[PDB]
Amino acid sequence: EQTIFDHKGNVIKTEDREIQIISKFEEPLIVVLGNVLSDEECDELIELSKSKLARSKVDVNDIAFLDDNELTAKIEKRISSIMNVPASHGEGLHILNYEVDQQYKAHYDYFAEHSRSAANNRISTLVMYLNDVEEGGETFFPKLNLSVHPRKGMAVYFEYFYQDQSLNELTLHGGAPVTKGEKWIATQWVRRGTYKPPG
Amino acid sequence: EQTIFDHKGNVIKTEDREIQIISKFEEPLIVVLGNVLSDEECDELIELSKSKLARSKVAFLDDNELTAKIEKRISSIMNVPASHGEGLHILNYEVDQQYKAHYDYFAEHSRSAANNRISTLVMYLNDVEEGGETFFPKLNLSVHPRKGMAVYFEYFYQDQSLNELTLHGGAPVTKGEKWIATQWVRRGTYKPPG
Numbered sequence: 001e002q003t004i005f006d007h008k009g010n011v012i013k014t015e016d017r018e019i020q021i022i023s024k025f026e027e028p029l030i031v032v033l034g035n036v037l038s039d040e041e042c043d044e045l046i047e048l049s050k051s052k053l054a055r056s057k058v059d060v061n062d063i064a065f066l067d068d069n070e071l072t073a074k075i076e077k078r079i080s081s082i083m084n085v086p087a088s089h090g091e092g093l094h095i096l097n098y099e100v101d102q103q104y105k106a107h108y109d110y111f112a113e114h115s116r117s118a119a120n121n122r123i124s125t126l127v128m129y130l131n132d133v134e135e136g137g138e139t140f141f142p143k144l145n146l147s148v149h150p151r152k153g154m155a156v157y158f159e160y161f162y163q164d165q166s167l168n169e170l171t172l173h174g175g176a177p178v179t180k181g182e183k184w185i186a187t188q189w190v191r192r193g194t195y196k197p198p199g
Numbered sequence: 200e201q202t203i204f205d206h207k208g209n210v211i212k213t214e215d216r217e218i219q220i221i222s223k224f225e226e227p228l229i230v231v232l233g234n235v236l237s238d239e240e241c242d243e244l245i246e247l248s249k250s251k252l253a254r255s256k257v258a259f260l261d262d263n264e265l266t267a268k269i270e271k272r273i274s275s276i277m278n279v280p281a282s283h284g285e286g287l288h289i290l291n292y293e294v295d296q297q298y299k300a301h302y303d304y305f306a307e308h309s310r311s312a313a314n315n316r317i318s319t320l321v322m323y324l325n326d327v328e329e330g331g332e333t334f335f336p337k338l339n340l341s342v343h344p345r346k347g348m349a350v351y352f353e354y355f356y357q358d359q360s361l362n363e364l365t366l367h368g369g370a371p372v373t374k375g376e377k378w379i380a381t382q383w384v385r386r387g388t389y390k391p392p393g
């Protein structure tokens with residue numbers, strides 16, 4: 001099958017940065033990427049997460065995705081070149097923190113048949129590692145026996161838009177328990193069609 | 200099965216450097232490793248290769264302090280004493296050069312098979328403009344060259360079909376050039392005593 005990700009060679013030359021292609025698992029397509037985010041961009045994304053939370057009072061505490069800003073739009077543009085899909089298909093920079101012994105149990109990123117979101121389903125994912133994880137925290141694909149270990153500024157790309165649906169089901173993945181330290185990530189989930197309202 | 204490479208977590212701490220564990224294919228074990236050699240160490244290994252060729256009596260490097268220090272770091276990574284290593288084998292690909300898919304271990308009934316290879320570390324000593332990936336055709340997996348990085352894999356399994364899955368090669372270099380050092384590790388001590 002043809003893939004969305006359409007990049008030959010060892011680097012991806014985007015407008016503001018050069019991405020390194022580190023390794024590939026060819027089908028379903030899984031790619032480890034280097035140099036995706038600067039150290040300072042990783043730190044700044046974390047900070048935006050903590051600030052948005054620090055502004056919660058009784059958004060209301062009683063009732064995730066960063067607010068759009070110069071930094072998030074610059075990063076979404078860069079991601080857009082990597083993923084070969086316009087930024088408007090992106091759900092936005094979703095920030096996630098794992099404390100020790102937290103994990104993300106294996107799942108599919110594309111939506112179940114019963115979600116209304118399945119009207120415009122997800123097609124591909126980028127997981128960016130915003131810090132270094134003392135122990136644990138690997139992104140693992142249990143049906144492929146593959147795992148990507150977190151590393152600040154690196155990312156894992158994968159897609160699930162294949163005609164053969166058994167290939168999409170191979171993209172079952174999760175975030176392994178953090179056994180020491182903590183883990184910060186940004187995820188960009190990309191939809192088949194435009195997702196953000198115009199701007 | 201258990202594996203030779205025995206390293207939990209995300210870094211491997213050696214005496215002089217901290218290696219980064221980047222990605223793992225679990226079986227046969229294939230590991231992408233980061234921060235294995237400094238840029239200075241990479242360049243110096245290339246120059247040693249070139250200088251050794253200059254003295255040509257028309258290649259493994261000769262033993263010196265650098266190679267011993269690197270081989271000691273590698274032994275920590277691979278969990279096997281350096282005396283098992285064949286030595287730093289330097290290899291240069293020019294454009295359109297390739298290493299067709301092969302096994303690193305010797306045929307079971309070859310002369311060298313009495314002390315067969317059990318694991319390989321391929322260290323990328325420069326950046327390759329295009330091509331030159333280390334590919335495992337039966338596994339649909341490739342590791343692209345990155346200066347300072349490396350790929351580890353082992354083929355010491357009881358189930359021989361696992362070892363056969365370690366078939367691999369060096370894809371053609373289509374732009375630039377490619378330099379690598381390889382450490383091939385033997386089941387038993389290999390270097391004469393020193």
Ligand SMILES: O=C(O)CCC(=O)C(=O)O
Pocket residue numbers: 104109125127137138139140173174175176185187
């Ligand atoms: O934490 C991880 O490594 C996996 C994250 C993930 O699966 C997701 O964000 O969709």
Ligand SMILES: O=C(O)CCC(=O)C(=O)O
Pocket residue numbers: 298303319321331332333334367368369370379381
């Ligand atoms: O050049 C490569 O990437 C492959 C090296 C290799 O197969 C070996 O040294 O045994």
Ligand SMILES: [Co+2]
Pocket residue numbers: 107108109173
């Ligand atoms: Co996910």
Ligand SMILES: [Co+2]
Pocket residue numbers: 301302303367
């Ligand atoms: Co080989």
